[PDB]
Amino acid sequence: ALPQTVRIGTDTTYAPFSSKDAKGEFIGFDIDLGNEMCKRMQVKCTWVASDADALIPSLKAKKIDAIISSLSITDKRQQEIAFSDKLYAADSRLIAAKGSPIQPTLESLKGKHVGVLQGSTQEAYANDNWRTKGVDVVAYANQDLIYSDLTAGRLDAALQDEVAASEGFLKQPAGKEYAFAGPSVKDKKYFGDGTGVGLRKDDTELKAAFDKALTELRQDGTYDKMAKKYFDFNVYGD
């Protein structure tokens, strides 16, 4: 059976998906999706703010029943936990000067300087896929020095999370003469081909319920109405 109340963990440091406003309220597209699915599942849901690194451990330990926290459905994570069907994509993407001919291909990136943030999944992807095939991958301690170096012409491009870059540089005046270079970069091992509700593998009833509610809110147009509040592109991907 489903619990009387489903506890959902989320890392509230990631607008526009999950954050806390000035009154401490949970806000974001994750919160909207979670709340809408819980409504259709007719279960009470309680949001629980958690450190990012504590989400999966808390889930495994049954401190929470679900994770909705832009949790990429990576191959590695699927060794340990289950996921709902995809909620939206969390792929990465190149940013470069507006009009740049750069593409996320080996042929285009050969001999180019591509900035990535130290310790990021973007760094991992670029080091494992591009650095070893003739791309000059430069790792940064500070995200903002990446952007500054891009604007200064010390980088050809920067590999960033797509929505984070969209909301955090491209929408700022500083990013006005910059744009995505090519399409999003997709990889099941690094970016997950989607985010999903993170769930314990044995909780099949809970996953089925989330999956059912999600297809229904997508099919009757609720998904797009909710997404339009935050995004002017196809955030779902796919």
UniProtKB/Swiss-Prot annotation:
<keyword id="KW-0732">Signal</keyword>
<comment type="function">
    <text>Part of the ABC transporter complex HisPMQ-ArgT involved in lysine/arginine/ornithine transport. Binds lysine, arginine and ornithine. Can also bind histidine, with much lower affinity. Stimulates ATPase activity of HisP.</text>
</comment>
<feature type="binding site">
    <location>
        <position position="69"/>
    </location>
    <ligand>
        <name>L-arginine</name>
    </ligand>
</feature>
<dbReference type="InterPro" id="IPR018313">
    <property type="entry name" value="SBP_3_CS"/>
</dbReference>
<keyword id="KW-0029">Amino-acid transport</keyword>
<feature type="binding site">
    <location>
        <position position="70"/>
    </location>
    <ligand>
        <name>L-ornithine</name>
    </ligand>
</feature>
<feature type="binding site">
    <location>
        <position position="72"/>
    </location>
    <ligand>
        <name>L-arginine</name>
    </ligand>
</feature>
<feature type="binding site">
    <location>
        <position position="72"/>
    </location>
    <ligand>
        <name>L-lysine</name>
    </ligand>
</feature>
<dbReference type="Pfam" id="PF00497">
    <property type="entry name" value="SBP_bac_3"/>
</dbReference>
<dbReference type="GO" id="GO:0030288">
    <property type="term" value="C:outer membrane-bounded periplasmic space"/>
</dbReference>
<feature type="binding site">
    <location>
        <position position="77"/>
    </location>
    <ligand>
        <name>L-lysine</name>
    </ligand>
</feature>
<dbReference type="GO" id="GO:0006865">
    <property type="term" value="P:amino acid transport"/>
</dbReference>
<feature type="binding site">
    <location>
        <position position="69"/>
    </location>
    <ligand>
        <name>L-ornithine</name>
    </ligand>
</feature>
<feature type="binding site">
    <location>
        <position position="72"/>
    </location>
    <ligand>
        <name>L-ornithine</name>
    </ligand>
</feature>
<feature type="binding site">
    <location>
        <position position="11"/>
    </location>
    <ligand>
        <name>L-ornithine</name>
    </ligand>
</feature>
<feature type="binding site">
    <location>
        <position position="121"/>
    </location>
    <ligand>
        <name>L-lysine</name>
    </ligand>
</feature>
<keyword id="KW-0574">Periplasm</keyword>
<dbReference type="GO" id="GO:0016597">
    <property type="term" value="F:amino acid binding"/>
</dbReference>
<keyword id="KW-1015">Disulfide bond</keyword>
<keyword id="KW-0813">Transport</keyword>
<comment type="similarity">
    <text>Belongs to the bacterial solute-binding protein 3 family.</text>
</comment>
<dbReference type="InterPro" id="IPR001638">
    <property type="entry name" value="Solute-binding_3/MltF_N"/>
</dbReference>
<feature type="binding site">
    <location>
        <position position="70"/>
    </location>
    <ligand>
        <name>L-arginine</name>
    </ligand>
</feature>
<feature type="binding site">
    <location>
        <position position="161"/>
    </location>
    <ligand>
        <name>L-arginine</name>
    </ligand>
</feature>
<protein>
    <recommendedName>
        <fullName>Lysine/arginine/ornithine-binding periplasmic protein</fullName>
    </recommendedName>
</protein>
<feature type="binding site">
    <location>
        <position position="161"/>
    </location>
    <ligand>
        <name>L-ornithine</name>
    </ligand>
</feature>
<comment type="subunit">
    <text>The complex is composed of two ATP-binding proteins (HisP), two transmembrane proteins (HisM and HisQ) and a solute-binding protein (ArgT).</text>
</comment>
<feature type="binding site">
    <location>
        <position position="77"/>
    </location>
    <ligand>
        <name>L-arginine</name>
    </ligand>
</feature>
<feature type="disulfide bond">
    <location>
        <begin position="38"/>
        <end position="45"/>
    </location>
</feature>
<feature type="binding site">
    <location>
        <position position="121"/>
    </location>
    <ligand>
        <name>L-ornithine</name>
    </ligand>
</feature>
<feature type="binding site">
    <location>
        <position position="11"/>
    </location>
    <ligand>
        <name>L-arginine</name>
    </ligand>
</feature>
<feature type="binding site">
    <location>
        <position position="121"/>
    </location>
    <ligand>
        <name>L-arginine</name>
    </ligand>
</feature>
<feature type="binding site">
    <location>
        <position position="77"/>
    </location>
    <ligand>
        <name>L-ornithine</name>
    </ligand>
</feature>
<feature type="binding site">
    <location>
        <position position="11"/>
    </location>
    <ligand>
        <name>L-lysine</name>
    </ligand>
</feature>
<dbReference type="InterPro" id="IPR005768">
    <property type="entry name" value="Lys_Arg_Orn-bd"/>
</dbReference>
<feature type="binding site">
    <location>
        <position position="70"/>
    </location>
    <ligand>
        <name>L-lysine</name>
    </ligand>
</feature>
